[PDB]
Amino acid sequence: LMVKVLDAVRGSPAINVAVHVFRKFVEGIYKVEIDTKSYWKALGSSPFHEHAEVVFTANDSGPRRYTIAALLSPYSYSTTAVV
């Protein structure tokens, strides 16, 4: 078994590398998260077993704008602006 990555580099690059090797167990190597809203996750073992009265209401209001100039997209010789 031989694994070789990026033996020689002369210029000035910008590089993201992730090498995983498994031989004979979870993992997250590059993760980004924005505005994650999850309610009532993994709610116990036996809740609300016999009798329950629940008023579930959720409110998040307002004009929401998302601007991304680049999502998973590098450049080499470029100009990028978000006015």
Q: Minimal distance in Å, beta carbon 4 to a copy of itself?
A: 5
Q: Minimal distance in Å, beta carbon 17 to a copy of itself?
A: 5
CB 59 within 8 A of CB 45: no
Q: Identify the H or E element spanning 52.
A: none
Question: Number of C-alpha atoms within 13 angstroms, CB side, residue 34?
Answer: 6
Known binding site: residues? 4, 78
Q: Minimal distance in Å, beta carbon 73 to a copy of itself?
A: 4
User: How far from chain centre, in Å, is Cα 65?
Assistant: 19
